[PDB]
Amino acid sequence: GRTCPKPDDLPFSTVVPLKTFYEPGEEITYSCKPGYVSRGGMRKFICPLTGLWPINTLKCTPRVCPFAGILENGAVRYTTFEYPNTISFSCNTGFYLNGADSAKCTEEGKWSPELPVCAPIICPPPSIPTFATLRVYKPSAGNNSLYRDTAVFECLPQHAMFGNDTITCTTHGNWTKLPECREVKCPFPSRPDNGFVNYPAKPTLYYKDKATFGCHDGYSLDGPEEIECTKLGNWSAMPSCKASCKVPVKKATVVYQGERVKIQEKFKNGMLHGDKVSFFCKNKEKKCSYTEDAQCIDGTIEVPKCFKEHSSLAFWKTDASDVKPC
Ligand SMILES: *[C@@H]1O[C@H](CO)[C@@H](O[C@@H]2O[C@H](CO)[C@@H](O[C@@H]3O[C@H](CO[C@H]4O[C@H](CO)[C@@H](O)[C@H](O)[C@@H]4O[C@@H]4O[C@H](CO)[C@@H](O)[C@H](O)[C@H]4NC(C)=O)[C@@H](O)[C@H](O[C@H]4O[C@H](CO)[C@@H](O)[C@H](O)[C@@H]4O[C@@H]4O[C@H](CO)[C@@H](O[C@@H]5O[C@H](CO)[C@@H](O)[C@H](O)[C@@H]5O)[C@H](O)[C@H]4NC(C)=O)[C@@H]3O)[C@H](O)[C@H]2NC(C)=O)[C@H](O)[C@H]1NC(C)=O
Ligand SMILES: *[C@@H]1O[C@H](CO)[C@@H](O[C@@H]2O[C@H](CO)[C@@H](O[C@@H]3O[C@H](CO[C@H]4O[C@H](CO)[C@@H](O)[C@H](O)[C@@H]4O[C@@H]4O[C@H](CO)[C@@H](O)[C@H](O)[C@H]4NC(C)=O)[C@@H](O)[C@H](O[C@H]4O[C@H](CO)[C@@H](O)[C@H](O)[C@@H]4O[C@@H]4O[C@H](CO)[C@@H](O[C@H]5O[C@H](CO)[C@@H](O)[C@H](O)[C@@H]5O)[C@H](O)[C@H]4NC(C)=O)[C@@H]3O)[C@H](O)[C@H]2NC(C)=O)[C@H](O)[C@H]1NC(C)=O
Ligand SMILES: *[C@@H]1O[C@H](CO)[C@@H](O[C@@H]2O[C@H](CO)[C@@H](O[C@@H]3O[C@H](CO[C@@H]4O[C@H](CO)[C@@H](O)[C@H](O)[C@@H]4O[C@@H]4O[C@H](CO)[C@@H](O)[C@H](O)[C@H]4NC(C)=O)[C@@H](O)[C@H](O)[C@@H]3O)[C@H](O)[C@H]2NC(C)=O)[C@H](O)[C@H]1NC(C)=O
Ligand SMILES: *[C@@H]1O[C@H](CO)[C@@H](O[C@@H]2O[C@H](CO)[C@@H](O[C@H]3O[C@H](CO[C@H]4O[C@H](CO)[C@@H](O)[C@H](O)[C@@H]4O)[C@@H](O)[C@H](O[C@@H]4O[C@H](CO)[C@@H](O)[C@H](O)[C@@H]4O)[C@@H]3O)[C@H](O)[C@H]2NC(C)=O)[C@H](O)[C@H]1NC(C)=O
């Protein structure tokens, strides 16, 4: 007699019982696979005497989970919302994901886990360190702060801040490192030889107290006029009063700070300690002029050997300063 052959394999379906041939009268059942549905549901068929399976209209399609394309204050990555697809979640800047960062459309057509929600990152009010005060703080969310809000500490008078005055509200709802404020003391600064020092009239000097230095005529400071008590207990500097130099020649054109000057004119009131200058010398061979340097150090300046004075107009090809350069 005729038999029906092995039934067609339709997409996303199973057939029960599955055999390679059937006697007329035997029943098969097509079902959608878990996670699929079809217009009509299960199709049952009985092998007819002709041995021909009739037409099967079963169309098995994925279950569709509910629309999950919008995360308030964030983003969803998805292709479609159908079984068995995963969707991914993330939050805009300043929000955190309250829930799982992914979810799956299950064979039952619901999301697992449940869809998350985005919420504002918040820090509680910050603690004030000891001997610190709070300059810049205003809450931006009820009484709490929002992500990347800042607070600024300043120390009490006579206290140095170790660390940094500005804290930020982090992603972890806690603030960045607090700074410490300790009291710091400096010794009295030493009066320099050939000068004086002024600092405030009181028995101890603290962080940020200023001392100013002066020199007697004929001396200048070899460092800054004003110094301050630093966070490490020492002073910003300790300058000396150093001796000025007499102009070492009666008349000469020199280079000072990259320009030609008359040394008698530019330094009519002496040369300060530090003042550097270049004297002009003649190369007799190549009939041209070169410079050698000289510096005022604590009342002494060494004019180069090559320099020849009584410079008006005399020596062949005139003053070294007026001769063509080498
Ligand atoms: C706000 O709120 C937040 C929420 O919690 C807080 O955030 C936390 O920050 C703290 C740290 O302050 C975190 O805890 C700590 O985690 C440290 C890092 O762990 C990583 O490395 C571990 C190595 O064993 C490993 O177990 C982890 O897997 C982890 O690794 C990584 O994985 C990520 C991916 O997920 C990768 O991207 C990373 O690249 C990868 N990194 C690594 C290294 O693999 C941890 O070190 C720290 O331990 C200290 O404190 C413990 C206190 O009980 C103590 O038991 C530990 O021993 C340790 O201490 C020190 O010991 C270590 C050695 O174990 C010393 O280090 C070495 O010295 C060797 C010399 O012999 C040298 O050879 C080595 O090279 C090395 O230098 C170290 O010197 C010791 N230090 C001291 C002082 O003794 C701790 O467990 C916490 O997990 C964070 N949580 C969160 C949610 O963020 C935040 O703190 C809050 N903020 C404020 C301001 O309060
Ligand atoms: C910045 O952030 C800070 C910190 O959070 C914040 O400061 C907070 O500010 C709020 C308000 O300014 C303070 O709190 C609450 O104030 C209560 C006083 O008033 C009420 O009455 C007025 C009347 O005009 C009404 O208008 C108010 O709305 C309010 O009453 C309401 O009453 C109706 C009745 O019709 C209810 O329908 C409402 O639910 C109720 N509303 C509210 C909001 O409560 C004060 O009494 C409360 O105190 C509570 O909660 C405290 C939590 O810390 C707790 O310490 C207290 O002890 C007290 O809790 C009491 O708990 C008892 C048990 O432990 C309970 O016992 C009896 O009741 C039940 C019976 O069923 C049983 O438990 C028991 O058998 C017994 O009979 C008490 O009932 C219960 N008391 C109350 C009143 O419920 C609230 O504090 C905050 O205190 C304050 N927080 C801090 C830390 O300062 C600030 O506002 C923020 N800044 C900004 C700008 O936002
Ligand atoms: C205590 O420690 C703190 C933590 O380390 C210190 O804070 C840090 O300060 C430094 C410098 O002050 C910050 O870094 C620098 O950032 C520069 C990048 O700046 C940007 O410029 C881009 C243009 O090319 C913009 O597209 C960016 O938006 C950004 O912005 C602007 O910056 C302007 C000032 O320059 C400002 O006027 C604008 O309003 C602002 N605009 C915007 C949108 O931001 C780099 O060029 C530098 O090389 C360097 O990286 C550093 O970021 C900051 N720490 C953190 C976590 O942000 C703090 O200084 C210290 N306190 C003390 C007293 O030392
Ligand atoms: C006011 O206060 C303090 C004194 O209380 C002064 O601080 C001192 O300043 C010096 C330099 O400014 C610092 O010490 C050393 O710093 C550098 C770099 O140090 C780094 O590199 C070393 C490797 O050499 C390594 O350990 C670390 O990575 C470190 O960060 C060094 O090059 C140098 O180190 C040596 O100093 C020795 C003298 O003590 C010599 O024998 C060595 O040959 C070499 O020069 C340098 O000394 C410190 O910060 C600090 N020192 C101490 C002891 O406290 C501060 O300068 C002063 N200011 C004023 C204005 O008076």
| DSSP string for 223-286 | S-SEEEB-TTSSBS----EEEPBPPSSSS-EEEETTEEEEHHHHTTT-BPTT-EEEEEEEETTT
CA–CA distance from 165 to each of 19, 135, 153, 176, 215 (Å)? 80, 10, 5, 11, 38
Query: Which distant-in-sequence residues (6+ apart) come within 8 Å of 208 by Cβ?
Result: 158, 160, 228, 229
Q: Which ligand is nearest to the CA of 224?
A: 4
Q: Which of 136, 164, 165 to mutate to test the pocket of ligand 3 (most atoms within 8 A of CB)?
A: 164
Q: Which atom of ligand 2 is nearest to the CA of 139?
A: 99
Burial of 186 (0-12, 13-18, 19+ CB in 10 A): buried
Query: Which distant-in-sequence residues (6+ apart) come within 8 Å of 267 by Cβ?
Result: 247, 275
Give the phi and the psi of residue 13 in degrees, each rounded to 5: -130, 165
Q: CA-CA distance, 87 to 106, in Å (whole number)?
A: 12
Q: CA-CA distance, 296 to 270, in Å (whole number)?
A: 10
Q: CA-CA distance, 50 to 71, in Å (whole number)?
A: 58
Q: Which atom of ligand 2 is nearest to the CA of 143?
A: 1
- Going from the Cα of 224 to the center of ligand 4, the distance in angstroms, rounded, reads 22
Q: Which ligand is nearest to the CA of 176?
A: 1
Q: Which atom of ligand 4 is nearest to the CA of 232?
A: 2
For the chain, the distance separating the N- and C-terminal CA atoms, rounded to the nearest angstrom, is: 123
Handedness of CA 8, 9, 10, 13 (dihedral sign): positive
Q: Which ligand is nearest to the CA of 152?
A: 3
- Going from the Cα of 282 to the center of ligand 1, the distance in angstroms, rounded, reads 71
CA–CA distance from 161 to each of 114, 136, 152, 155, 177 (Å)? 49, 16, 12, 6, 13
Q: H/E/C letters for each residue in 143-160?
A: CEEECCCEEEEEECCCEE
Q: Tell me how many degrees the CA angle 178-184-189 measures, rounded to the nearest 5.
A: 145
CA nearest neighbour of 263 among 250, 274, 272: 250
The DSSP bridge pattern shows strands 43-46 and 36-38 to be unpaired
Nearest alpha carbon, ligand 2 atom 94? 143
DSSP class per residue in 110-127: SEES---EEEE-EEPPPP
Q: CA-CA distance, 68 to 80, in Å (whole number)?
A: 9
Q: What is the torsion angle, in degrees rounded to the nearest 10, for the CA atoms of residue 68, residue 71, residue 77 and residue 83?
A: -20
Q: Tell me how many degrees the CA angle 114-116-120 measures, rounded to the nearest 5.
A: 160
Helix, strand or coil for residue 8?
coil
Query: Is 223's C-beta closer than 6 angstroms to any atom of ligand 4?
Result: no
Residues across the chain: 326
- Going from the Cα of 139 to the center of ligand 2, the distance in angstroms, rounded, reads 22
Q: CA-CA distance, 283 to 166, in Å (whole number)?
A: 63
- Going from the Cα of 271 to the center of ligand 1, the distance in angstroms, rounded, reads 61
**What is the set of domains in the chain, with CATH numbers?**
1-62 (2.10.70.10), 63-121 (2.10.70.10), 122-183 (2.10.70.10), 184-243 (2.10.70.10), 244-325 (2.10.70.10)
CA nearest neighbour of 240 among 213, 260, 261: 213
Q: How was this structure determined?
A: X-ray
Query: Which distant-in-sequence residues (6+ apart) come within 8 Å of 68 by Cβ?
Result: 76, 78, 81, 87, 103, 111, 115
* Both tokens assigned to 292: 């050698």
Q: Which ligand is nearest to the CA of 177?
A: 1
Q: Which residue has the tokens 């806690």?
A: 174
CA nearest neighbour of 117 among 131, 105, 138, 103: 103
b vs e for 69-104, b when ≥16 Cβ sit within 10 Å of the residue's Cβ?
eebeebebebeebebeeebebebeebbbeebeeebb
**Do 274 and 256 contact (CB within 8 A), yes or no?**
no
Q: CA-CA distance, 110 to 67, in Å (whole number)?
A: 10
Q: Which of 234, 235, 236, 238 to mutate to test the pocket of ligand 4 (most atoms within 8 A of CB)?
A: 234
CA–CA distance from 291 to each of 304, 307, 315, 316 (Å)? 9, 9, 17, 18
Type of residue found at 246? K
Type of residue found at 92? N
Query: Is 127's C-beta closer than 6 angstroms to any atom of ligand 4?
Result: no
**Do 79 and 123 contact (CB within 8 A), yes or no?**
no
Q: Which atom of ligand 3 is nearest to the CA of 166?
A: 1
For this experimental structure, what is the resolution in angstroms? 2.4
Q: Which of 137, 138, 143 to mutate to test the pocket of ligand 2 (most atoms within 8 A of CB)?
A: 143
Half-sphere CA count of 11, side-chain side, radius 13 A: 8
Q: CA-CA distance, 266 to 272, in Å (whole number)?
A: 11
CA–CA distance from 262 to each of 62, 139, 190, 251, 253 (Å)? 97, 66, 38, 7, 5
**Do 163 and 179 contact (CB within 8 A), yes or no?**
yes
Q: CA-CA distance, 14 to 123, in Å (whole number)?
A: 56
Query: Is 232's C-beta closer than 6 angstroms to any atom of ligand 4?
Result: yes
Nearest alpha carbon, ligand 1 atom 91? 172
Query: Is 174's C-beta closer than 6 angstroms to any atom of ligand 1?
Result: yes
Pocket residues for ligand 2 (CB within 6 Å)? 142-143
